[PDB]
Design a protein around this ligand. Sequence first.
Ligand SMILES: CC(C)c1cccc2c(-c3ccc(CNC(=N)N)c(F)c3)c(C(=O)O)[nH]c12
Ligand SMILES: [Zn+2]
Ligand SMILES: [Zn+2]
Length: 232
Amino acid sequence: SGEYPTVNEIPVGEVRLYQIADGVWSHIATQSFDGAVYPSNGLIVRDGDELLLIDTAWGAKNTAALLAEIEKQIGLPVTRAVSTHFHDDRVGGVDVLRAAGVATYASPSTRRLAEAEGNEIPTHSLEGLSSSGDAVRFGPVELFYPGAAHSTDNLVVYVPSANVLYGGCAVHELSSTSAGNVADADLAEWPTSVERIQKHYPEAEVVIPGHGLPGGLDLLQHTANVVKAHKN
Ligand SMILES: CC(C)c1cccc2c(-c3ccc(CNC(=N)N)c(F)c3)c(C(=O)O)[nH]c12
Ligand SMILES: [Zn+2]
Ligand SMILES: [Zn+2]
């Protein structure tokens, strides 16, 4: 009924949308992994009379539910999707998207890592993102590679029309105590990568983490803090 939806409010298999700004939504779903339930976010950006999707809803059935929820609440076709790193909360559901006619994209690094992990593999490679600080335009967003953080391949997404920064899993929510799932992370480089994001997007008004509640620019410094406390 208005506030941002939390993990215990979304049964596994249902998807919520949340209006972030004009023409910008987040999508929220929940999934089981190793016997615990987690929420996760993605993004939807209006692209004329089409939509750009950022990240799957963490699984095939969740992603089918996402497409149905978009049709119900927005009613414009999803034509392209970008996955922001190789984990299943970002690519699980790419096969559903591809069979629904959505063109799926990721960096070559993400595609290689997804293939090696046994995860679903986006079809198209996004060049121009291999060096930290690189940025490319993709429809109504800018894609930015900040350097290694949560994963070596993680991308962030900026919506310039709305000053919305989608940090993905390189950014944690303010209530977070922990650095999340760090299995593939670079804890030493992560603060430097966050500093790059801070320098590149100083006018961000909304910052969306990969998991949990959006906030403002403070999510960036908070993330650096939680990662440094973890590494130590
Ligand atoms: C590898 C991938 C598919 C995956 C599986 C299971 C958990 C995670 C997490 C995670 C783990 C705990 C928290 C703490 N917050 C809570 N609500 N439990 C959090 F935010 C994310 C991340 C992440 O870190 O990207 N990724 C995950
Ligand atoms: Zn991840
Ligand atoms: Zn994640």
